[PDB]
Amino acid sequence: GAKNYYDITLALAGICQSARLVQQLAHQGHCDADALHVSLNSIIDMNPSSTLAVFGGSEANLRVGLETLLGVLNASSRQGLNAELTRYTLSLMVLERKLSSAKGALDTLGNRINGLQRQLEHFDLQSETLMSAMAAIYVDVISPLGPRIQVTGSPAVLQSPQVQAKVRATLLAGIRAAVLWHQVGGGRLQLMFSRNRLTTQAKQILAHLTPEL
Ligand SMILES: [Hg+2]
Ligand SMILES: [Hg+2]
Ligand SMILES: [Hg+2]
Ligand SMILES: [Hg+2]
Ligand SMILES: [Hg+2]
Ligand SMILES: [Hg+2]
Ligand SMILES: [Hg+2]
Ligand SMILES: [Hg+2]
Ligand SMILES: [Hg+2]
Ligand SMILES: [Hg+2]
């Protein structure tokens, strides 16, 4: 119901999940399939009873994002791997605010997203066809509204048009999570003032996911 750190943490975990999947992709050319399936499905599922239902109704679906979030909030080096994750997450947040403020853009985007039903009729969500249709939406709708997210990794890997397509489609997911984040009370100032509460809540969810330990 009312603004709470549990929902804010999940939505933040979605933005970090996008960021981390882009990073696996750019360095290795492959990413966690289960996490990507979750992130891609959050773009298209128009049934959102709760924040968590956006990601399929299970906390396990965001594990990647929750673990990433812990470094993005706290480790915060200016170099190395974690500094890439931080730069991607802040770029996503800056782009979503441009999208939210740009007269008309959010209506356009919703229509373009619903329009993936044209392709989903004949092609699965993870196909090269869907990946390129979702990348086209990111590129046509979102990327002109602000600074480009500069993606770094192995340059040879990144010349693949299929890697490029998946990158862009996953960036669309991170935008979709940032939209949710603001819808559940999240924002810039909240994030500067509530860090330890987000970190603690994410640690709690990961402990809840791992009763083995
Ligand atoms: Hg994040
Ligand atoms: Hg690398
Ligand atoms: Hg990926
Ligand atoms: Hg993947
Ligand atoms: Hg089709
Ligand atoms: Hg058809
Ligand atoms: Hg048809
Ligand atoms: Hg989106
Ligand atoms: Hg906001
Ligand atoms: Hg439980």
PDB file of C-alpha atoms and ligand atoms in Angstrom:
ATOM      1  CA  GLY A   1       0.000   0.000   0.000  1.00  0.00           C
ATOM      2  CA  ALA A   2       1.771   3.097   1.327  1.00  0.00           C
ATOM      3  CA  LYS A   3       5.392   3.885   0.435  1.00  0.00           C
ATOM      4  CA  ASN A   4       7.706   1.257   1.933  1.00  0.00           C
ATOM      5  CA  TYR A   5      11.329   0.168   1.690  1.00  0.00           C
ATOM      6  CA  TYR A   6      10.463  -3.416   0.799  1.00  0.00           C
ATOM      7  CA  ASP A   7       8.815  -2.369  -2.519  1.00  0.00           C
ATOM      8  CA  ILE A   8      11.454   0.314  -3.188  1.00  0.00           C
ATOM      9  CA  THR A   9      14.231  -2.204  -2.685  1.00  0.00           C
ATOM     10  CA  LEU A  10      12.646  -4.631  -5.206  1.00  0.00           C
ATOM     11  CA  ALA A  11      12.231  -1.966  -7.874  1.00  0.00           C
ATOM     12  CA  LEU A  12      15.797  -0.835  -7.277  1.00  0.00           C
ATOM     13  CA  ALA A  13      16.881  -4.470  -7.566  1.00  0.00           C
ATOM     14  CA  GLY A  14      15.295  -4.582 -11.032  1.00  0.00           C
ATOM     15  CA  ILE A  15      17.330  -1.595 -12.237  1.00  0.00           C
ATOM     16  CA  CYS A  16      20.552  -3.220 -10.842  1.00  0.00           C
ATOM     17  CA  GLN A  17      19.563  -6.537 -12.465  1.00  0.00           C
ATOM     18  CA  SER A  18      19.419  -4.870 -15.862  1.00  0.00           C
ATOM     19  CA  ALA A  19      22.764  -3.252 -15.191  1.00  0.00           C
ATOM     20  CA  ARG A  20      24.446  -6.489 -14.198  1.00  0.00           C
ATOM     21  CA  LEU A  21      23.030  -8.483 -17.136  1.00  0.00           C
ATOM     22  CA  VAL A  22      24.395  -5.802 -19.541  1.00  0.00           C
ATOM     23  CA  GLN A  23      27.782  -6.181 -17.868  1.00  0.00           C
ATOM     24  CA  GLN A  24      27.830 -10.013 -18.142  1.00  0.00           C
ATOM     25  CA  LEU A  25      26.838  -9.647 -21.802  1.00  0.00           C
ATOM     26  CA  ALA A  26      29.414  -6.997 -22.663  1.00  0.00           C
ATOM     27  CA  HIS A  27      32.385  -8.909 -21.041  1.00  0.00           C
ATOM     28  CA  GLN A  28      31.442 -12.551 -21.775  1.00  0.00           C
ATOM     29  CA  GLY A  29      28.758 -12.434 -24.483  1.00  0.00           C
ATOM     30  CA  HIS A  30      26.410 -14.490 -22.275  1.00  0.00           C
ATOM     31  CA  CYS A  31      24.322 -13.714 -19.228  1.00  0.00           C
ATOM     32  CA  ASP A  32      22.236 -15.442 -16.533  1.00  0.00           C
ATOM     33  CA  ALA A  33      19.336 -16.773 -18.637  1.00  0.00           C
ATOM     34  CA  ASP A  34      16.879 -17.036 -15.767  1.00  0.00           C
ATOM     35  CA  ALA A  35      17.516 -13.454 -14.631  1.00  0.00           C
ATOM     36  CA  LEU A  36      17.258 -12.157 -18.205  1.00  0.00           C
ATOM     37  CA  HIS A  37      13.989 -14.066 -18.732  1.00  0.00           C
ATOM     38  CA  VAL A  38      12.622 -12.347 -15.615  1.00  0.00           C
ATOM     39  CA  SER A  39      13.830  -8.906 -16.720  1.00  0.00           C
ATOM     40  CA  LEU A  40      12.480  -9.245 -20.254  1.00  0.00           C
ATOM     41  CA  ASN A  41       9.101 -10.559 -19.001  1.00  0.00           C
ATOM     42  CA  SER A  42       8.739  -7.455 -16.707  1.00  0.00           C
ATOM     43  CA  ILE A  43       8.588  -5.304 -19.882  1.00  0.00           C
ATOM     44  CA  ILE A  44       5.577  -7.091 -21.329  1.00  0.00           C
ATOM     45  CA  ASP A  45       3.415  -8.280 -18.406  1.00  0.00           C
ATOM     46  CA  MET A  46       0.482  -5.888 -18.107  1.00  0.00           C
ATOM     47  CA  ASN A  47      -0.801  -7.651 -14.937  1.00  0.00           C
ATOM     48  CA  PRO A  48       0.855  -5.803 -11.954  1.00  0.00           C
ATOM     49  CA  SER A  49      -1.075  -6.511  -8.687  1.00  0.00           C
ATOM     50  CA  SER A  50       2.132  -5.772  -6.756  1.00  0.00           C
ATOM     51  CA  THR A  51       5.744  -4.588  -7.251  1.00  0.00           C
ATOM     52  CA  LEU A  52       6.882  -8.137  -6.843  1.00  0.00           C
ATOM     53  CA  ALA A  53       4.282  -9.442  -9.387  1.00  0.00           C
ATOM     54  CA  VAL A  54       6.055  -7.274 -12.031  1.00  0.00           C
ATOM     55  CA  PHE A  55       9.035  -9.640 -11.577  1.00  0.00           C
ATOM     56  CA  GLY A  56       6.872 -12.767 -11.436  1.00  0.00           C
ATOM     57  CA  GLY A  57       5.802 -12.869  -7.811  1.00  0.00           C
ATOM     58  CA  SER A  58       8.968 -14.467  -6.440  1.00  0.00           C
ATOM     59  CA  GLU A  59      11.863 -12.813  -4.647  1.00  0.00           C
ATOM     60  CA  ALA A  60      14.196 -15.465  -6.134  1.00  0.00           C
ATOM     61  CA  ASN A  61      13.565 -13.876  -9.530  1.00  0.00           C
ATOM     62  CA  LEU A  62      15.440 -10.738  -8.440  1.00  0.00           C
ATOM     63  CA  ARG A  63      18.407 -12.425  -6.715  1.00  0.00           C
ATOM     64  CA  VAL A  64      20.880 -11.098  -9.277  1.00  0.00           C
ATOM     65  CA  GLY A  65      19.583  -7.541  -8.887  1.00  0.00           C
ATOM     66  CA  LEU A  66      19.491  -7.743  -5.056  1.00  0.00           C
ATOM     67  CA  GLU A  67      23.162  -8.888  -4.875  1.00  0.00           C
ATOM     68  CA  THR A  68      24.173  -6.182  -7.379  1.00  0.00           C
ATOM     69  CA  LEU A  69      22.293  -3.562  -5.425  1.00  0.00           C
ATOM     70  CA  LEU A  70      24.444  -4.233  -2.344  1.00  0.00           C
ATOM     71  CA  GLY A  71      27.607  -3.269  -4.262  1.00  0.00           C
ATOM     72  CA  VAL A  72      26.049  -0.349  -6.123  1.00  0.00           C
ATOM     73  CA  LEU A  73      24.905   1.291  -2.869  1.00  0.00           C
ATOM     74  CA  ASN A  74      27.952   0.482  -0.725  1.00  0.00           C
ATOM     75  CA  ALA A  75      31.141  -0.599  -2.491  1.00  0.00           C
ATOM     76  CA  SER A  76      31.070   2.426  -4.772  1.00  0.00           C
ATOM     77  CA  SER A  77      34.617   2.443  -6.173  1.00  0.00           C
ATOM     78  CA  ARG A  78      35.359   4.862  -9.002  1.00  0.00           C
ATOM     79  CA  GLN A  79      37.139   2.104 -10.891  1.00  0.00           C
ATOM     80  CA  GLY A  80      36.783  -1.570 -11.785  1.00  0.00           C
ATOM     81  CA  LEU A  81      33.732  -3.756 -12.259  1.00  0.00           C
ATOM     82  CA  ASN A  82      31.542  -2.233  -9.644  1.00  0.00           C
ATOM     83  CA  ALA A  83      32.149   1.237 -11.002  1.00  0.00           C
ATOM     84  CA  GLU A  84      30.586   0.045 -14.324  1.00  0.00           C
ATOM     85  CA  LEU A  85      27.467  -1.158 -12.484  1.00  0.00           C
ATOM     86  CA  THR A  86      27.149   2.133 -10.740  1.00  0.00           C
ATOM     87  CA  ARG A  87      27.519   4.128 -13.971  1.00  0.00           C
ATOM     88  CA  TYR A  88      24.885   1.966 -15.758  1.00  0.00           C
ATOM     89  CA  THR A  89      22.391   2.250 -12.879  1.00  0.00           C
ATOM     90  CA  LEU A  90      22.762   6.062 -12.581  1.00  0.00           C
ATOM     91  CA  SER A  91      22.487   6.440 -16.388  1.00  0.00           C
ATOM     92  CA  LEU A  92      19.272   4.394 -16.343  1.00  0.00           C
ATOM     93  CA  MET A  93      17.826   6.553 -13.570  1.00  0.00           C
ATOM     94  CA  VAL A  94      18.785   9.807 -15.392  1.00  0.00           C
ATOM     95  CA  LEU A  95      17.205   8.495 -18.630  1.00  0.00           C
ATOM     96  CA  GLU A  96      13.979   7.480 -16.906  1.00  0.00           C
ATOM     97  CA  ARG A  97      13.538  10.988 -15.502  1.00  0.00           C
ATOM     98  CA  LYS A  98      13.979  12.430 -19.007  1.00  0.00           C
ATOM     99  CA  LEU A  99      11.369   9.943 -20.255  1.00  0.00           C
ATOM    100  CA  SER A 100       9.006  10.850 -17.421  1.00  0.00           C
ATOM    101  CA  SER A 101       9.350  14.590 -18.102  1.00  0.00           C
ATOM    102  CA  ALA A 102       9.227  14.420 -21.951  1.00  0.00           C
ATOM    103  CA  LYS A 103       5.691  15.404 -23.023  1.00  0.00           C
ATOM    104  CA  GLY A 104       4.176  12.414 -24.794  1.00  0.00           C
ATOM    105  CA  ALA A 105       7.038   9.898 -24.404  1.00  0.00           C
ATOM    106  CA  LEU A 106       5.544   7.582 -21.767  1.00  0.00           C
ATOM    107  CA  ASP A 107       2.270   7.165 -23.809  1.00  0.00           C
ATOM    108  CA  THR A 108       4.359   6.450 -26.902  1.00  0.00           C
ATOM    109  CA  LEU A 109       6.391   3.898 -25.004  1.00  0.00           C
ATOM    110  CA  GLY A 110       3.391   2.073 -23.582  1.00  0.00           C
ATOM    111  CA  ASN A 111       1.927   1.779 -27.078  1.00  0.00           C
ATOM    112  CA  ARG A 112       5.174   0.577 -28.601  1.00  0.00           C
ATOM    113  CA  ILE A 113       5.515  -2.014 -25.793  1.00  0.00           C
ATOM    114  CA  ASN A 114       1.958  -3.285 -26.256  1.00  0.00           C
ATOM    115  CA  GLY A 115       2.728  -3.545 -29.950  1.00  0.00           C
ATOM    116  CA  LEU A 116       5.241  -6.370 -29.296  1.00  0.00           C
ATOM    117  CA  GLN A 117       2.124  -8.583 -29.492  1.00  0.00           C
ATOM    118  CA  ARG A 118       2.563  -8.358 -33.280  1.00  0.00           C
ATOM    119  CA  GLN A 119       5.828 -10.395 -32.896  1.00  0.00           C
ATOM    120  CA  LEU A 120       4.891 -12.418 -29.790  1.00  0.00           C
ATOM    121  CA  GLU A 121       2.154 -14.105 -31.840  1.00  0.00           C
ATOM    122  CA  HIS A 122       4.781 -16.141 -33.754  1.00  0.00           C
ATOM    123  CA  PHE A 123       8.034 -15.711 -31.766  1.00  0.00           C
ATOM    124  CA  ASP A 124       9.083 -16.374 -28.224  1.00  0.00           C
ATOM    125  CA  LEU A 125      10.232 -13.621 -25.906  1.00  0.00           C
ATOM    126  CA  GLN A 126      13.887 -14.734 -26.001  1.00  0.00           C
ATOM    127  CA  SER A 127      14.104 -15.006 -29.860  1.00  0.00           C
ATOM    128  CA  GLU A 128      16.414 -12.790 -31.945  1.00  0.00           C
ATOM    129  CA  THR A 129      13.204 -11.349 -33.445  1.00  0.00           C
ATOM    130  CA  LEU A 130      11.818 -10.151 -30.071  1.00  0.00           C
ATOM    131  CA  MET A 131      15.211  -8.961 -28.879  1.00  0.00           C
ATOM    132  CA  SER A 132      15.528  -6.729 -31.973  1.00  0.00           C
ATOM    133  CA  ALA A 133      11.946  -5.471 -31.661  1.00  0.00           C
ATOM    134  CA  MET A 134      12.573  -4.480 -27.983  1.00  0.00           C
ATOM    135  CA  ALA A 135      15.977  -2.910 -28.836  1.00  0.00           C
ATOM    136  CA  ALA A 136      14.208  -0.867 -31.516  1.00  0.00           C
ATOM    137  CA  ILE A 137      11.865   0.508 -28.882  1.00  0.00           C
ATOM    138  CA  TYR A 138      14.779   1.443 -26.583  1.00  0.00           C
ATOM    139  CA  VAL A 139      16.630   3.031 -29.493  1.00  0.00           C
ATOM    140  CA  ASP A 140      13.659   4.836 -31.105  1.00  0.00           C
ATOM    141  CA  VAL A 141      11.856   5.987 -27.931  1.00  0.00           C
ATOM    142  CA  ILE A 142      14.174   6.256 -24.999  1.00  0.00           C
ATOM    143  CA  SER A 143      17.803   6.727 -26.172  1.00  0.00           C
ATOM    144  CA  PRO A 144      17.244  10.085 -27.921  1.00  0.00           C
ATOM    145  CA  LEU A 145      15.756  11.572 -24.731  1.00  0.00           C
ATOM    146  CA  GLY A 146      19.104  11.778 -22.940  1.00  0.00           C
ATOM    147  CA  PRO A 147      22.785  10.882 -22.719  1.00  0.00           C
ATOM    148  CA  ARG A 148      23.723   7.488 -24.199  1.00  0.00           C
ATOM    149  CA  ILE A 149      24.559   4.692 -21.789  1.00  0.00           C
ATOM    150  CA  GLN A 150      28.150   3.943 -22.857  1.00  0.00           C
ATOM    151  CA  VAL A 151      28.524   0.169 -22.617  1.00  0.00           C
ATOM    152  CA  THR A 152      32.049  -1.210 -22.018  1.00  0.00           C
ATOM    153  CA  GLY A 153      33.268  -4.753 -22.311  1.00  0.00           C
ATOM    154  CA  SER A 154      35.156  -6.832 -24.880  1.00  0.00           C
ATOM    155  CA  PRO A 155      34.932  -4.725 -28.036  1.00  0.00           C
ATOM    156  CA  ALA A 156      34.871  -7.780 -30.326  1.00  0.00           C
ATOM    157  CA  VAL A 157      31.894  -9.276 -28.446  1.00  0.00           C
ATOM    158  CA  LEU A 158      30.082  -5.935 -28.810  1.00  0.00           C
ATOM    159  CA  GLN A 159      30.298  -5.888 -32.638  1.00  0.00           C
ATOM    160  CA  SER A 160      27.659  -8.666 -32.681  1.00  0.00           C
ATOM    161  CA  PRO A 161      24.294  -7.173 -33.686  1.00  0.00           C
ATOM    162  CA  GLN A 162      22.627  -9.893 -31.537  1.00  0.00           C
ATOM    163  CA  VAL A 163      24.686  -8.854 -28.490  1.00  0.00           C
ATOM    164  CA  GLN A 164      23.797  -5.219 -29.257  1.00  0.00           C
ATOM    165  CA  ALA A 165      20.105  -6.126 -29.506  1.00  0.00           C
ATOM    166  CA  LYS A 166      20.103  -7.950 -26.135  1.00  0.00           C
ATOM    167  CA  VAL A 167      21.967  -5.067 -24.502  1.00  0.00           C
ATOM    168  CA  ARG A 168      19.413  -2.570 -25.668  1.00  0.00           C
ATOM    169  CA  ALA A 169      16.480  -4.850 -24.802  1.00  0.00           C
ATOM    170  CA  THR A 170      17.950  -5.314 -21.258  1.00  0.00           C
ATOM    171  CA  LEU A 171      18.422  -1.536 -20.917  1.00  0.00           C
ATOM    172  CA  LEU A 172      14.686  -1.233 -21.705  1.00  0.00           C
ATOM    173  CA  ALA A 173      14.032  -3.555 -18.774  1.00  0.00           C
ATOM    174  CA  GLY A 174      16.156  -1.323 -16.472  1.00  0.00           C
ATOM    175  CA  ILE A 175      14.092   1.662 -17.628  1.00  0.00           C
ATOM    176  CA  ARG A 176      10.930  -0.288 -16.921  1.00  0.00           C
ATOM    177  CA  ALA A 177      12.157  -0.980 -13.343  1.00  0.00           C
ATOM    178  CA  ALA A 178      13.104   2.692 -12.845  1.00  0.00           C
ATOM    179  CA  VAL A 179       9.554   3.659 -13.843  1.00  0.00           C
ATOM    180  CA  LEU A 180       8.277   1.298 -11.160  1.00  0.00           C
ATOM    181  CA  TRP A 181      10.748   2.623  -8.619  1.00  0.00           C
ATOM    182  CA  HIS A 182       9.243   6.156  -8.960  1.00  0.00           C
ATOM    183  CA  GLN A 183       5.704   4.744  -8.983  1.00  0.00           C
ATOM    184  CA  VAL A 184       6.373   3.086  -5.511  1.00  0.00           C
ATOM    185  CA  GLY A 185       7.790   6.206  -3.857  1.00  0.00           C
ATOM    186  CA  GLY A 186      11.365   5.876  -4.905  1.00  0.00           C
ATOM    187  CA  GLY A 187      13.553   8.696  -6.061  1.00  0.00           C
ATOM    188  CA  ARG A 188      16.869  10.540  -5.956  1.00  0.00           C
ATOM    189  CA  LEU A 189      16.486  12.104  -2.511  1.00  0.00           C
ATOM    190  CA  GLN A 190      14.964   8.944  -1.031  1.00  0.00           C
ATOM    191  CA  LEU A 191      18.027   7.120  -2.299  1.00  0.00           C
ATOM    192  CA  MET A 192      20.531   9.619  -0.793  1.00  0.00           C
ATOM    193  CA  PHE A 193      18.673   9.477   2.537  1.00  0.00           C
ATOM    194  CA  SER A 194      17.717   5.852   2.891  1.00  0.00           C
ATOM    195  CA  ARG A 195      20.725   3.828   1.827  1.00  0.00           C
ATOM    196  CA  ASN A 196      21.357   1.658   4.900  1.00  0.00           C
ATOM    197  CA  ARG A 197      17.608   0.808   4.985  1.00  0.00           C
ATOM    198  CA  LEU A 198      17.723  -0.410   1.350  1.00  0.00           C
ATOM    199  CA  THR A 199      20.961  -2.346   1.994  1.00  0.00           C
ATOM    200  CA  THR A 200      19.581  -3.986   5.117  1.00  0.00           C
ATOM    201  CA  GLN A 201      16.317  -4.925   3.423  1.00  0.00           C
ATOM    202  CA  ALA A 202      18.153  -6.458   0.483  1.00  0.00           C
ATOM    203  CA  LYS A 203      20.385  -8.478   2.883  1.00  0.00           C
ATOM    204  CA  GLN A 204      17.211  -9.710   4.615  1.00  0.00           C
ATOM    205  CA  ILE A 205      15.694 -10.895   1.324  1.00  0.00           C
ATOM    206  CA  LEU A 206      18.909 -12.727   0.351  1.00  0.00           C
ATOM    207  CA  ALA A 207      19.010 -14.398   3.785  1.00  0.00           C
ATOM    208  CA  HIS A 208      15.337 -15.288   3.368  1.00  0.00           C
ATOM    209  CA  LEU A 209      16.271 -16.846  -0.017  1.00  0.00           C
ATOM    210  CA  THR A 210      19.043 -18.921   1.490  1.00  0.00           C
ATOM    211  CA  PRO A 211      17.861 -20.876   4.554  1.00  0.00           C
ATOM    212  CA  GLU A 212      20.564 -23.515   3.687  1.00  0.00           C
ATOM    213  CA  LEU A 213      23.046 -21.031   5.147  1.00  0.00           C
TER     214      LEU A 213
HETATM  215 HG    HG B   1      20.406  -0.432  -8.689  1.00  0.00          HG
HETATM  216 HG    HG B   2      36.086  -8.034 -19.856  1.00  0.00          HG
HETATM  217 HG    HG B   3      22.175 -10.381 -21.076  1.00  0.00          HG
HETATM  218 HG    HG B   4      21.304 -14.057 -21.189  1.00  0.00          HG
HETATM  219 HG    HG B   5       4.626 -12.010 -36.263  1.00  0.00          HG
HETATM  220 HG    HG B   6      -0.227 -14.569 -37.918  1.00  0.00          HG
HETATM  221 HG    HG B   7      -2.304 -13.966 -37.328  1.00  0.00          HG
HETATM  222 HG    HG B   8      10.236   0.392 -20.454  1.00  0.00          HG
HETATM  223 HG    HG B   9      10.160   9.985  -8.075  1.00  0.00          HG
HETATM  224 HG    HG B  10       9.544 -17.399   4.383  1.00  0.00          HG
END
